Amino acid sequence: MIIPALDLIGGTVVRVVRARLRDYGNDPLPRLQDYAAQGAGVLHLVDLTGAKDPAKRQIPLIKTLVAGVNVPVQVGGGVRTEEDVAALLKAGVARVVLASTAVKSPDVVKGWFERFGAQALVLALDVRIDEHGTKQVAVSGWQENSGVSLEQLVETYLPVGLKHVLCTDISRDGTLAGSDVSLYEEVCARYPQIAFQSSGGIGDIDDIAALRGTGVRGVIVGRALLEGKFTVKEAIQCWQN
């Protein structure tokens, strides 16, 4: 499926561009609602306010947004503790997106899988392809690699039933550059029991077409939709054909 995505900061719709941020206004709910109206089955939100300060997690806004659409929303941003996870689920989010903590504290996160179930969690892994061609996990675009490959980390979580992995190619994140097809083709084939989501690099409908035969289950689209390159409807039509 197509997974429309919005980045929120103090209720302001934004997205990382390449790394800067641009303001797409302050009415996230009508946006999401129109995404859903066009047939989206899943939505993605990053709470950048919550990411910077867990105590400032935009729980009331998140509640509103979730309540305001009829589809599961996966929500990330500053998910550092078991309490963060529970708070977001309690607010009504369908899945909690675990990013840096998934790399940082795998044993702790495996316990979260045990408590919340694999359907409640998405592991968001940023990947750099190094000089050797290894898919290196990094916790962000501005930090060095963390010393673990995508495969090794995925393998870490398979024993607790890992089902959802969001994989961002760091080089293409928010660049409109076209996503990295080979990366997704390899991982998806290796772990067919996992539903991979691709993120970054979607600039036009052709980028979505490029992902079709790869095994990638979901395609995060943020920037392209905000900039009017194509619609959710067109993205879905392309994705499904």
Residue 190 sits at φ, ψ, to 5 deg, of -75, -35
What DSSP string describes 9-37? ETTEEEEEE--EEEE--S-HHHHHHHHHH
Strands 12-17 and 2-9: antiparallel
Specify whether the CB–CB gap between 67 and 93 falls below 8 A: no
**Catalytic residue check, 126:** yes
240/197 Cα distance (integer angstroms): 15
- What residue type is 101 in one-letter code? T
CA distances for 236 relative to 37, 40, 165, 220, angstroms: 12, 8, 20, 12
Cβ partners under 8 Å of residue 129, min gap 6: 135, 136, 169, 171, 180, 183
Active-site residue (options: 126, 169, 173, 180): 126
Which residues belong to the active site? 7, 126
